Amino acid sequence: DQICIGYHANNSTETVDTILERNVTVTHAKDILEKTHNGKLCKLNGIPPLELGDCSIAGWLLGNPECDRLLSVPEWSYIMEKENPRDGLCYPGSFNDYEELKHLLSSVKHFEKVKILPKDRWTQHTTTGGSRACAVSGNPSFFRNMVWLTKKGSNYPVAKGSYNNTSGEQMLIIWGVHHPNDETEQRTLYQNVGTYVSVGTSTLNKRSTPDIATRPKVNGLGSRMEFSWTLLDMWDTINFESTGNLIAPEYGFKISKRGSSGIMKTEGTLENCETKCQTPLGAINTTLPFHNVHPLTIGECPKYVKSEKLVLATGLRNVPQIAIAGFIEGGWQGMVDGWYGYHHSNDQGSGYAADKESTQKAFDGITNKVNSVIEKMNTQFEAVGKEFSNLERRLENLNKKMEDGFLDVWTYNAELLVLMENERTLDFHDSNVKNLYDKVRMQLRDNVKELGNGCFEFYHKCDDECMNSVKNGTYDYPKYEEESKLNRN
Amino acid sequence: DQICIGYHANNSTETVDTILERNVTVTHAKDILEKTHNGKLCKLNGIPPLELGDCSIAGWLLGNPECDRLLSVPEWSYIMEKENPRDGLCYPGSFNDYEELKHLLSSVKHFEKVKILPKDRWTQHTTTGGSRACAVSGNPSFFRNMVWLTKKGSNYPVAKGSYNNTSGEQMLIIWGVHHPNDETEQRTLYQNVGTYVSVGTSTLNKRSTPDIATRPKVNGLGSRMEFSWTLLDMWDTINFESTGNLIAPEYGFKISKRGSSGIMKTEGTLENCETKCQTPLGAINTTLPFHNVHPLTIGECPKYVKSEKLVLATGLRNVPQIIAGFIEGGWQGMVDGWYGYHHSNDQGSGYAADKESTQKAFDGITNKVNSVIEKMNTQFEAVGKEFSNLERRLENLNKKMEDGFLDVWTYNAELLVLMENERTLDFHDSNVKNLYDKVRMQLRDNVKELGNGCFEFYHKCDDECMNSVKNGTYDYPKYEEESKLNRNE
Amino acid sequence: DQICIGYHANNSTETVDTILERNVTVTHAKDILEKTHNGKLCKLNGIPPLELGDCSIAGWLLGNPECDRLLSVPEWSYIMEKENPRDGLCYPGSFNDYEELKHLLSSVKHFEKVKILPKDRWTQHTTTGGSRACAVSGNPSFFRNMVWLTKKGSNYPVAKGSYNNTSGEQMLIIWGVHHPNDETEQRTLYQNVGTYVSVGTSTLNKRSTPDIATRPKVNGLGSRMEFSWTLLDMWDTINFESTGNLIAPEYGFKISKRGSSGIMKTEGTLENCETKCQTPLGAINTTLPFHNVHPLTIGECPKYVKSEKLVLATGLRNVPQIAIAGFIEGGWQGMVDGWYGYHHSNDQGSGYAADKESTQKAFDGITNKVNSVIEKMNTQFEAVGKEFSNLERRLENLNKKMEDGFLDVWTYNAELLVLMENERTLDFHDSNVKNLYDKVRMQLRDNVKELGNGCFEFYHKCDDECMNSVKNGTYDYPKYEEESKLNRNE
Ligand SMILES: CC(=O)N[C@H]1[C@H](O[C@@H]2[C@@H](O)[C@H](O)O[C@H](CO)[C@@H]2O)O[C@H](CO)[C@@H](O[C@@H]2O[C@H](CO[C@]3(C(=O)O)C[C@H](O)[C@@H](NC(C)=O)[C@H]([C@H](O)[C@H](O)CO)O3)[C@H](O)[C@H](O)[C@H]2O)[C@@H]1O
Ligand SMILES: CC(=O)N[C@H]1[C@H](O[C@@H]2[C@@H](O)[C@H](O)O[C@H](CO)[C@@H]2O)O[C@H](CO)[C@@H](O[C@@H]2O[C@H](CO[C@]3(C(=O)O)C[C@H](O)[C@@H](NC(C)=O)[C@H]([C@H](O)[C@H](O)CO)O3)[C@H](O)[C@H](O)[C@H]2O)[C@@H]1O
Ligand SMILES: CC(=O)N[C@H]1[C@H](O[C@@H]2[C@@H](O)[C@H](O)O[C@H](CO)[C@@H]2O)O[C@H](CO)[C@@H](O[C@@H]2O[C@H](CO[C@]3(C(=O)O)C[C@H](O)[C@@H](NC(C)=O)[C@H]([C@H](O)[C@H](O)CO)O3)[C@H](O)[C@H](O)[C@H]2O)[C@@H]1O
Ligand SMILES: *[C@@H]1O[C@H](CO)[C@@H](O)[C@H](O)[C@H]1NC(C)=O
Ligand SMILES: *[C@@H]1O[C@H](CO)[C@@H](O)[C@H](O)[C@H]1NC(C)=O
Ligand SMILES: *[C@@H]1O[C@H](CO)[C@@H](O)[C@H](O)[C@H]1NC(C)=O
Ligand SMILES: *[C@@H]1O[C@H](CO)[C@@H](O)[C@H](O)[C@H]1NC(C)=O
Ligand SMILES: *[C@@H]1O[C@H](CO)[C@@H](O)[C@H](O)[C@H]1NC(C)=O
Ligand SMILES: *[C@@H]1O[C@H](CO)[C@@H](O)[C@H](O)[C@H]1NC(C)=O
Ligand SMILES: *[C@@H]1O[C@H](CO)[C@@H](O)[C@H](O)[C@H]1NC(C)=O
Ligand SMILES: *[C@@H]1O[C@H](CO)[C@@H](O)[C@H](O)[C@H]1NC(C)=O
Missing domain, CATH: 3.90.20.10 (Hemagglutinin Ectodomain; Chain B)
Structure with missing residues (x-):
C-alpha cells in the first residue's frame, strides 16, 4: 500500500x-x-636523549668541572638543553662559530673520546695551571679536556705538537687562546711579549696574536679565553706551534654513529616512554x-x-x-x-x-x-x-x-x-x-x-x-x- | 489562470x-x-615619520654638518630615505655592519641622545681637528657627534675613557679609526708609528691597527675612516684605549621606545594625512x-x-x-x-x-x-x-x-x-x-x-x-x- | 518509434x-x-656552453697549465663543471670568496682578457720563478695569468703598480699572497722578513701579512698561496704595493655581455642539438x-x-x-x-x-x-x-x-x-x-x-x-x- x-x-x-x-x-x-599530548619528555626510537642538565654544549665539550657527569656519554636521539644554562665557560671568553658547532652536533648521535696529545708529553712546560673561576671544593682548577701551558722555571721554549688521524673517522679538535689583563700577567705566565699561536692542517691555516688590555670584570676576572674548532679528516695531520698563550687540547671527539637529531630547549627531565614525534610540551601519537x-x-x-x-x-x-x-x-x-x-x-x-x-x-x-x-x-x-x-x-x-x-x-x-x-x-x-x-x-x-x-x-x-x-x-x-x-x- | x-x-x-x-x-x-591609493605619504597611527631628506642613516648618526636639522629628532613611525642619498660620509671611509645597524633601526622609535664622554675631559690631547671635506662656511669642520684626537705639543699620551651604562636602557655607541695616506701625515698628527685602537666590553674584545698606503682620491683625500658600533647592555661598561688614530664618540645613543617600523626608499615629502598601510606610491585604505x-x-x-x-x-x-x-x-x-x-x-x-x-x-x-x-x-x-x-x-x-x-x-x-x-x-x-x-x-x-x-x-x-x-x-x-x-x- | x-x-x-x-x-x-628527455647536453638558445672539462673555475681564471685550451673562450650560455675536478690550484692553497665569485660569474656569458700589467715593467725584480707543483714537460712552470716576483741579486725593492679602468665596463682582478714554510725560504726568495701586501681602490682597502709555519705536505709542498678578487668600477684606479710575498696579476677580465646563466655539475660532453630547458640528465621540450x-x-x-x-x-x-x-x-x-x-x-x-x-x-x-x-x-x-x-x-x-x-x-x-x-x-x-x-x-x-x-x-x-x-x-x-x-x- x-x-x-x-x-x-x-x-x-x-x-x-x-x-x-x-x-x-x-x-x-x-x-x-x-x-593532545602526554606532557612528558620521552625517548625517540627507544634511545634516551642527552640530558645536559644545567650545562651547555661548550661546557660539555670543554669539560667544565661542574659537568663531570658527562665525561662518558652513551648514544642519544636528541639533545635537551635549558634556555639559560648556568655552567658554560667558567673562565670568561668567547667561542668562535658556536652556532655552526651546534648545527654539526645536530647530525651526530654518538661520539668517542680519544686521547690525542697526552699531558705528559710536554716535558719542557708547566701543565698544572688553574684558576679560581673553575674551582673544585675550594681549590683552583681548570677544564678537564684542555691543558694550560705555562713557563717552566723562567723559559718558554717553542711548543710543537702533532697528531695523524689514524682513528678511523672524522675528529673534532678544540683549542684556545688566552688574552691577559696586563703586561705583568703576560710576563708572569709566559716570560715573553709579542707571542703567537699557529694551527695548521691540510686545508686550514690560522695564526692568532694575544690582546692585552683592561676589560670589565666577568666572574671576577678581566681576562678572556677564545676557543676555536676544526674537523680533522681521515689520514690528515694537525700541527700546533706557539710561543705563548696556547690552551692545548688533550682529547679529540671522533664521530661514531651519525644520523638525524636536533637540539630541543626545555626545562624538564626524561621519563619512560617511546615516541616518534616529540614537542617541548609532550609527545604526539597520531x-x-x-x-x-x-x-x-x-x-x-x-x-x-x-x-x-x-x-x-x-x-x-x-x-x-x-502514516x-x-x-x-x-x-x-x-x-x-x-x-x-x-x-x-x-x-x-x-x-x-x-x-x-x-x-x-x-x-x-x-x-x-x-x-x-x-x-x-x-x-x-x-x-x-x-x-x-x-x-x-x-x-x-x-x-x-x-x-x-x-x-x-x-x-x-x-x-x-x-x-x-x-x-x-x-x-x-x-x-x-x-x-x-x-x-x-x-x-x-x-x-x-x-x-x-x-x-x-x-x-x-x-x-x-x-x-x-x-x-x-x-x-x-x-x-x-x-x-x-x-x-x- | x-x-x-x-x-x-x-x-x-x-x-x-x-x-x-x-x-x-x-x-x-x-x-x-x-x-587605488591616496598618492601621498601619510602618518602611520598618527605619528609622523622621520624624514631624513638628503641625508643617510650614517650621516644622521655621526652628525654630518649638512644634517644639522636632525640633531633633535622626535618620535617616528617609519624612516623615509632616498635611494642614493647625497649627504652621507663627508670624510671618505666605510661603516662596518651597516645593514645590521639599519635592521636594528627598523625596530626602534623616538630614540634619545645622552652625552657620555664630554669633549672637555681630554685635557692631555687636542680635540679641535677638522677637514675640508666636511666644511661649513668655507672653514674646516668635522662630525658633530664625534671627536678627533690629535697630539698636543709634541706628545700623544695613552688615551683612556670609560662609561658605565646607568641610563636605563640599551645603548648604541659608534667609534672610528683613521687610516692616513703617508708616514709624514701619521707623524704630523700622532707623533708615533705602530699605534692601535682597543675597545672592550663584557662581551666585546676588539683591537685594530691603522694601515698606511697610497689610495685613489675620493672627495680630494687619499685617507679613509672606518666606523664600528656596539650595543651596550644595562649596568655594563665600555673601555677605550688608544695610542693613536682614535675617533672617540661624545654622544651615546639610547633606545627610548620600541615597536615595529621600517625603512622606505622614496623621493617624496610628508603631507597632512593618515593611514594604517603605506606604499611608496601612496596610502591604502581598504x-x-x-x-x-x-x-x-x-x-x-x-x-x-x-x-x-x-x-x-x-x-x-x-x-x-x-x-x-x-x-x-x-x-x-x-x-x-x-x-x-x-x-x-x-x-x-x-x-x-x-x-x-x-x-x-x-x-x-x-x-x-x-x-x-x-x-x-x-x-x-x-x-x-x-x-x-x-x-x-x-x-x-x-x-x-x-x-x-x-x-x-x-x-x-x-x-x-x-x-x-x-x-x-x-x-x-x-x-x-x-x-x-x-x-x-x-x-x-x-x-x-x-x-x-x-x-x-x-x-x-x-x-x-x-x-x-x-x-x-x-x-x-x-x-x-x-x-x-x-x-x- | x-x-x-x-x-x-x-x-x-x-x-x-x-x-x-x-x-x-x-x-x-x-x-x-x-x-622524458633526450639524454644529451645541448645548446641554450643556439649558443654552445663553456665546457671546462677537467679544469675548475679557479684553475681556468688563474691559468693552470693543464687547461691551456681555455686561454681564449667564446660566448657561452651556461657552464659545465665536474663534481670533483682534477686540475684546480696546482700550487696548494685557498681562494677567498670563491662561492661569491662563482655566483657572479654565473651571469656573464662573455669575457675579454685585457693586459693591465705587463711582465716587462718589473725591471727591478725577477719574474721568472716557477714550481714543480704544476710543471710542463718536466720543467717547472707557473700560472699563465699571474706573475711571481722574487729578489733580483740580493735586493727586493718596494713594488708598485697601478691601473686605471678605461676599458669600458667592470673588470675583475685577482691577486695572491704566498705563505712560505720556513725562514730560509723567505730569506732565499725575498731577502727580508716582516713583509706586507697592500691593495687599495676607491672602496677596497686591504693589508696582508704572510704566515710562516710547518704544514702537512700537499702535492709535496709545505707552502700555500692565498688568492683574493675584487671588481673595479669604470674610471676607477687600483693600487698595488708589497715588500714581499706578492703574486701580481698580468691580465684582467672585463665583462662583455650580461644575462642569465648557471653552473651545471655534469660529467658528459656537448652534442649537437638545441633546446630551451636543460637538465643534467638531458633536455626537455614540452x-x-x-x-x-x-x-x-x-x-x-x-x-x-x-x-x-x-x-x-x-x-x-x-x-x-x-531494441x-x-x-x-x-x-x-x-x-x-x-x-x-x-x-x-x-x-x-x-x-x-x-x-x-x-x-x-x-x-x-x-x-x-x-x-x-x-x-x-x-x-x-x-x-x-x-x-x-x-x-x-x-x-x-x-x-x-x-x-x-x-x-x-x-x-x-x-x-x-x-x-x-x-x-x-x-x-x-x-x-x-x-x-x-x-x-x-x-x-x-x-x-x-x-x-x-x-x-x-x-x-x-x-x-x-x-x-x-x-x-x-x-x-x-x-x-x-x-x-x-x-x-x-x-
Ligand atoms: C701562581 C700564583 O700564585 N700567582 C700569583 C702571583 O704570584 C707571584 C709569583 O709569580 C712571584 O714569583 O712571587 C710573588 C710573591 O713575591 C707572587 O707569589 O701574584 C699575583 C699578584 O701579584 C697573583 O695575583 C692575583 O691572582 C688572582 C688569581 O689567581 C689565578 C686565578 O684563580 O685566576 C690562579 C693563578 O695565580 C694563575 N694561574 C696560572 C699561573 O696558571 C691565574 C692567572 O693569574 C690568570 O692568567 C688570571 O687571569 O690566576 C687574580 O687573577 C687577581 O686579579 C690577581 O691580582 C697571582 O695569582
Ligand atoms: C695643520 C696643517 O695645516 N697641517 C698641514 C701641514 O702643515 C704642517 C705643520 O703642522 C708641521 O708642524 O710642519 C709642516 C712643515 O714641516 C707643515 O707646515 O702641511 C701638510 C703638507 O705639507 C698638509 O698637507 C695637506 O693637507 C691637506 C688636508 O688638511 C686637512 C683637510 O682639509 O682634510 C685638514 C687639516 O689641515 C689636517 N689635520 C688635521 C689635524 O685635521 C687634515 C689631515 O692632514 C688629513 O686630512 C687627515 O689625516 O686634513 C690634504 O690632505 C693635502 O693632500 C695635504 O697635502 C697639512 O694639512
Ligand atoms: C732555485 C733552487 O734550486 N732552489 C732550491 C735550493 O737551492 C738553493 C739556492 O736557492 C741557493 O742560492 O743555493 C743553494 C746551494 O748553495 C741551493 O741551490 O735548495 C733547496 C733545498 O735546500 C730547494 O729545495 C726543495 O725545493 C723543492 C722545489 O723547488 C722549487 C719548486 O719547483 O717549487 C724551485 C724553485 O726555483 C723555487 N723558487 C721559486 C722562485 O719558485 C721554489 C721555492 O722554493 C718555493 O717557494 C717552495 O716553497 O721551489 C721543494 O720545495 C722542496 O720542499 C724543497 O726542499 C730549492 O728549491
Ligand atoms: C556555532 O556554534 C559555536 C558553539 O560551538 C558558537 O560559538 C558560534 O557562535 C556558532 N556560530 C554561529 C554562526 O551561530
Ligand atoms: C699518517 O698515517 C697514514 C697511515 O698510517 C700515512 O699513510 C700517512 O703518510 C701519515 N701522515 C704523515 C704526514 O706521515
Ligand atoms: C500562510 O502561511 C502563514 C505562516 O505564518 C500563515 O500565518 C497564513 O495564515 C497562511 N496564509 C494562507 C492563505 O495560507
Ligand atoms: C572579454 O572582454 C575583454 C574586454 O572587456 C576582452 O579584452 C577579452 O578579449 C574578452 N574575452 C573574450 C574571450 O572574448
Ligand atoms: C655601574 O653602575 C652600577 C650601578 O649600580 C654598579 O652596580 C656597577 O658596579 C657599575 N660598574 C662598575 C664597573 O663599577
Ligand atoms: C531546424 O531548425 C532550423 C533553425 O533555423 C531551421 O532552419 C530548420 O528548417 C529546422 N529544420 C526542420 C526540419 O524543421
Ligand atoms: C589501479 O591499477 C593499477 C595498475 O594500473 C594497480 O597497480 C592499482 O593497485 C589499482 N588500484 C586500485 C584501487 O584498484
Ligand atoms: C682615469 O681615467 C679617467 C678617464 O681617462 C680620468 O678622468 C681619471 O682622472 C683617471 N684617474 C686618475 C687617478 O687620474
Whole structure:
C-alpha cells in the first residue's frame, strides 16, 4: 500500500562547518586535527636523549668541572638543553662559530673520546695551571679536556705538537687562546711579549696574536679565553706551534654513529616512554595529517596549522523530524542498518529496510575521499629549531618569515579544503537519495501514485514478494498492467 | 489562470569569469582586489615619520654638518630615505655592519641622545681637528657627534675613557679609526708609528691597527675612516684605549621606545594625512584581502598578487530575453527578490517574490564571501631588506623566497575565484529548479505543465488559492473532484 | 518509434583518478606531466656552453697549465663543471670568496682578457720563478695569468703598480699572497722578513701579512698561496704595493655581455642539438606545466613535482555496454560523431546521430578548463642550484628547507586539483545528458510513453520530419495532440 524512500538519523550532536552554512549537525564526522599530548619528555626510537642538565654544549665539550657527569656519554636521539644554562665557560671568553658547532652536533648521535696529545708529553712546560673561576671544593682548577701551558722555571721554549688521524673517522679538535689583563700577567705566565699561536692542517691555516688590555670584570676576572674548532679528516695531520698563550687540547671527539637529531630547549627531565614525534610540551601519537600542539618539533610529525577545529563531514545531515513520510520532511530514526533505505506498509506488517548497493557505494566514496585527503601529505624527519647569533639578525628574520609564510599557506589551504569538501559531501548525500527516488519512480511508472512527501501508494494489491522485487530492482511492470489499470479509473 | 517561476534581471553590466566560461554578465558582483591609493605619504597611527631628506642613516648618526636639522629628532613611525642619498660620509671611509645597524633601526622609535664622554675631559690631547671635506662656511669642520684626537705639543699620551651604562636602557655607541695616506701625515698628527685602537666590553674584545698606503682620491683625500658600533647592555661598561688614530664618540645613543617600523626608499615629502598601510606610491585604505599596488609595504596590508581583476559573483546571470518563466530567461518586473512568482488570473496579474528561498540563498552567498575574505591573516610586516656587495647569494635567496610566495598566492587566488564562480552559477540554477519541483510536487495532477516555467490549472483558482500555492499550504482534496472533471474532456 | 538519448563509447584504455573513485577508464585523457628527455647536453638558445672539462673555475681564471685550451673562450650560455675536478690550484692553497665569485660569474656569458700589467715593467725584480707543483714537460712552470716576483741579486725593492679602468665596463682582478714554510725560504726568495701586501681602490682597502709555519705536505709542498678578487668600477684606479710575498696579476677580465646563466655539475660532453630547458640528465621540450625529471634545471622549465601521474579527464566515463537501450544502461559504441547524441528507429530506417549544440558547449567548457589549469602558471628563467662553503652549513640547510617546502606545496596542490577537477568533469557529463533528456521530455510531453531505460515510445506515427523536429528543438505539440489522444486511451 506504501513504500517510502528516506535516509538515516541518530542522536549525534557533532557540528561541521561549510562554505555556505555554519554549525550543521551531522550523523558522523572525522577529526583530522590533533590537539593532545602526554606532557612528558620521552625517548625517540627507544634511545634516551642527552640530558645536559644545567650545562651547555661548550661546557660539555670543554669539560667544565661542574659537568663531570658527562665525561662518558652513551648514544642519544636528541639533545635537551635549558634556555639559560648556568655552567658554560667558567673562565670568561668567547667561542668562535658556536652556532655552526651546534648545527654539526645536530647530525651526530654518538661520539668517542680519544686521547690525542697526552699531558705528559710536554716535558719542557708547566701543565698544572688553574684558576679560581673553575674551582673544585675550594681549590683552583681548570677544564678537564684542555691543558694550560705555562713557563717552566723562567723559559718558554717553542711548543710543537702533532697528531695523524689514524682513528678511523672524522675528529673534532678544540683549542684556545688566552688574552691577559696586563703586561705583568703576560710576563708572569709566559716570560715573553709579542707571542703567537699557529694551527695548521691540510686545508686550514690560522695564526692568532694575544690582546692585552683592561676589560670589565666577568666572574671576577678581566681576562678572556677564545676557543676555536676544526674537523680533522681521515689520514690528515694537525700541527700546533706557539710561543705563548696556547690552551692545548688533550682529547679529540671522533664521530661514531651519525644520523638525524636536533637540539630541543626545555626545562624538564626524561621519563619512560617511546615516541616518534616529540614537542617541548609532550609527545604526539597520531595518524592525522595536522596538529596544533607546538611549532618546534623533532621527529616525524604532522603539519602545524593555526586552527582550532578541522572536522570532515562523513555522515548525513541530522534532521530528526520524521502514516510515515519520506525524505522530504526529514530523516528516519528507526532505520539502523544503513544510510539510505526503504519503509514498506502492506497487509503483512510494516517495517524498515536498507539499500545495500547505494550505501556501499557512498561509503566507499567517502572513505576514498578521507584517504585521499590524509595519505597525500608527505611526512619526513625534520628539526625546526635553529640558532643564530646576535650579529645575524637578518638571517634569523628571513628564517622566521619563511616559517610564517609556510604556516599561513597551509592554514588557508586546509581550512578552505575542509569547507569545500564538506559542502560537496552534503550535496552528495542529497543527490544519492534523489537518484534512488527517481530510479524507483521510473521503475514503477504509472502503476503507482506519487503522494509528494517521498513515496507512492500502489493501485493494486502488493504482497511481500512485490515489495522485495521493487527493492531488488526487478519489477515486472507488464504483469500488473491490466490489474493496476482498472483501479486508476 | 497561470503561475510562473523565474528569476531576476536588471541593466547591470558587470562581468565575471568561471572555470568553464569567460566574460559572463551578472546582476551583482564584488571586487576583492584593491587597485587605488591616496598618492601621498601619510602618518602611520598618527605619528609622523622621520624624514631624513638628503641625508643617510650614517650621516644622521655621526652628525654630518649638512644634517644639522636632525640633531633633535622626535618620535617616528617609519624612516623615509632616498635611494642614493647625497649627504652621507663627508670624510671618505666605510661603516662596518651597516645593514645590521639599519635592521636594528627598523625596530626602534623616538630614540634619545645622552652625552657620555664630554669633549672637555681630554685635557692631555687636542680635540679641535677638522677637514675640508666636511666644511661649513668655507672653514674646516668635522662630525658633530664625534671627536678627533690629535697630539698636543709634541706628545700623544695613552688615551683612556670609560662609561658605565646607568641610563636605563640599551645603548648604541659608534667609534672610528683613521687610516692616513703617508708616514709624514701619521707623524704630523700622532707623533708615533705602530699605534692601535682597543675597545672592550663584557662581551666585546676588539683591537685594530691603522694601515698606511697610497689610495685613489675620493672627495680630494687619499685617507679613509672606518666606523664600528656596539650595543651596550644595562649596568655594563665600555673601555677605550688608544695610542693613536682614535675617533672617540661624545654622544651615546639610547633606545627610548620600541615597536615595529621600517625603512622606505622614496623621493617624496610628508603631507597632512593618515593611514594604517603605506606604499611608496601612496596610502591604502581598504578591507579587501588582495591588492596589486606595490610589492614593498609597511603596515597592516592585504596580500600582494600579480593580477588585474578578482571579481566574485554574488548574483545571477543576466539573460533578460523574457509571459514566460526561467527556461527562456530572466525577468525585469521583479524588483524585490531573486526567485519569485508572476501570477495571472481574473482579478489582476502581477509579480511577487519568494522570501524563504531568496533569504536562504542570500545568506549562503554572504557566508561564502565572508569565508573567503575573513580566513586571511593580516599582521604587521615590512617587506624590504638591505644587503651589501659581498652578499649576493643572501639577496638572491630572499628574492627567490618572495617570488615563490607571490606565485603561490597568485595561482591560488585565481583558481579559487574561478571555481567559486562556477559553483555559485550552478547553485542559483539548482535553487530555481528546486522551487519548480516543489511547486510541481504540491500541485500534482490538478494542473498541466507547459515546458516554459509555469503551470496552467485545470480549475478556477483565485488569490487565496494562489497565495496558498506560494505559501506552501495547497489543499489537494478541495479541488480533486472539480479539477478532475475538466481533465478528461 | 523510439528516440534514445545517450553518450559515446570507444576502445580506450587510459585511466584517471578522482576523489571518490580510483582507476576509472575514460574516453579521452590529457597528461599534464612530462617524463622524458633526450639524454644529451645541448645548446641554450643556439649558443654552445663553456665546457671546462677537467679544469675548475679557479684553475681556468688563474691559468693552470693543464687547461691551456681555455686561454681564449667564446660566448657561452651556461657552464659545465665536474663534481670533483682534477686540475684546480696546482700550487696548494685557498681562494677567498670563491662561492661569491662563482655566483657572479654565473651571469656573464662573455669575457675579454685585457693586459693591465705587463711582465716587462718589473725591471727591478725577477719574474721568472716557477714550481714543480704544476710543471710542463718536466720543467717547472707557473700560472699563465699571474706573475711571481722574487729578489733580483740580493735586493727586493718596494713594488708598485697601478691601473686605471678605461676599458669600458667592470673588470675583475685577482691577486695572491704566498705563505712560505720556513725562514730560509723567505730569506732565499725575498731577502727580508716582516713583509706586507697592500691593495687599495676607491672602496677596497686591504693589508696582508704572510704566515710562516710547518704544514702537512700537499702535492709535496709545505707552502700555500692565498688568492683574493675584487671588481673595479669604470674610471676607477687600483693600487698595488708589497715588500714581499706578492703574486701580481698580468691580465684582467672585463665583462662583455650580461644575462642569465648557471653552473651545471655534469660529467658528459656537448652534442649537437638545441633546446630551451636543460637538465643534467638531458633536455626537455614540452608545453605541459609539470615535470619530474630532475630538480636542478637551467632555463625556462616547468614546475617540478614528486608525482608519477597527473592526468586530466577530458572525455566521458567508458561503460562499454549499451531494441537499443539509452544512457541508463551504459554508453554507445556506434556513435562516432560527438559526445552526446540520439538514436532513432522508425519505419523508414534506424541510425545514430549526434547533437551539435550540447557537444559544442561541453567541448568549449572542457577546453577552457584545461587552458585555465595550464596557462595560469607563470614560467620564468631560473637557475636552481647554489654553492656553499663548508662553514655555511646553516645557509645550505635554509636553502634546502625552502626548496623542499615549495616542492611539497606544489605537489599537494597539483594532486588535489587533478583529483577535484576529474570529479567535476565526470559529474558535468552526466548532468549534460540528464539535461538533454529532461529538455526533450518537457518539450515533447504526454504524447509518448516513457520507457525508463533512457528513451520514449511515441504514441503517434512520427516520420522523419518530426524526428528532426524533436532533434531540432521545434516540436509542434498541437499538430498530433488529437491523434495521440485517440490511441492512448485504447
Ligand atoms: C701562581 C700564583 O700564585 N700567582 C700569583 C702571583 O704570584 C707571584 C709569583 O709569580 C712571584 O714569583 O712571587 C710573588 C710573591 O713575591 C707572587 O707569589 O701574584 C699575583 C699578584 O701579584 C697573583 O695575583 C692575583 O691572582 C688572582 C688569581 O689567581 C689565578 C686565578 O684563580 O685566576 C690562579 C693563578 O695565580 C694563575 N694561574 C696560572 C699561573 O696558571 C691565574 C692567572 O693569574 C690568570 O692568567 C688570571 O687571569 O690566576 C687574580 O687573577 C687577581 O686579579 C690577581 O691580582 C697571582 O695569582
Ligand atoms: C695643520 C696643517 O695645516 N697641517 C698641514 C701641514 O702643515 C704642517 C705643520 O703642522 C708641521 O708642524 O710642519 C709642516 C712643515 O714641516 C707643515 O707646515 O702641511 C701638510 C703638507 O705639507 C698638509 O698637507 C695637506 O693637507 C691637506 C688636508 O688638511 C686637512 C683637510 O682639509 O682634510 C685638514 C687639516 O689641515 C689636517 N689635520 C688635521 C689635524 O685635521 C687634515 C689631515 O692632514 C688629513 O686630512 C687627515 O689625516 O686634513 C690634504 O690632505 C693635502 O693632500 C695635504 O697635502 C697639512 O694639512
Ligand atoms: C732555485 C733552487 O734550486 N732552489 C732550491 C735550493 O737551492 C738553493 C739556492 O736557492 C741557493 O742560492 O743555493 C743553494 C746551494 O748553495 C741551493 O741551490 O735548495 C733547496 C733545498 O735546500 C730547494 O729545495 C726543495 O725545493 C723543492 C722545489 O723547488 C722549487 C719548486 O719547483 O717549487 C724551485 C724553485 O726555483 C723555487 N723558487 C721559486 C722562485 O719558485 C721554489 C721555492 O722554493 C718555493 O717557494 C717552495 O716553497 O721551489 C721543494 O720545495 C722542496 O720542499 C724543497 O726542499 C730549492 O728549491
Ligand atoms: C556555532 O556554534 C559555536 C558553539 O560551538 C558558537 O560559538 C558560534 O557562535 C556558532 N556560530 C554561529 C554562526 O551561530
Ligand atoms: C699518517 O698515517 C697514514 C697511515 O698510517 C700515512 O699513510 C700517512 O703518510 C701519515 N701522515 C704523515 C704526514 O706521515
Ligand atoms: C572579454 O572582454 C575583454 C574586454 O572587456 C576582452 O579584452 C577579452 O578579449 C574578452 N574575452 C573574450 C574571450 O572574448
Ligand atoms: C655601574 O653602575 C652600577 C650601578 O649600580 C654598579 O652596580 C656597577 O658596579 C657599575 N660598574 C662598575 C664597573 O663599577
Ligand atoms: C500562510 O502561511 C502563514 C505562516 O505564518 C500563515 O500565518 C497564513 O495564515 C497562511 N496564509 C494562507 C492563505 O495560507
Ligand atoms: C589501479 O591499477 C593499477 C595498475 O594500473 C594497480 O597497480 C592499482 O593497485 C589499482 N588500484 C586500485 C584501487 O584498484
Ligand atoms: C682615469 O681615467 C679617467 C678617464 O681617462 C680620468 O678622468 C681619471 O682622472 C683617471 N684617474 C686618475 C687617478 O687620474
Ligand atoms: C531546424 O531548425 C532550423 C533553425 O533555423 C531551421 O532552419 C530548420 O528548417 C529546422 N529544420 C526542420 C526540419 O524543421
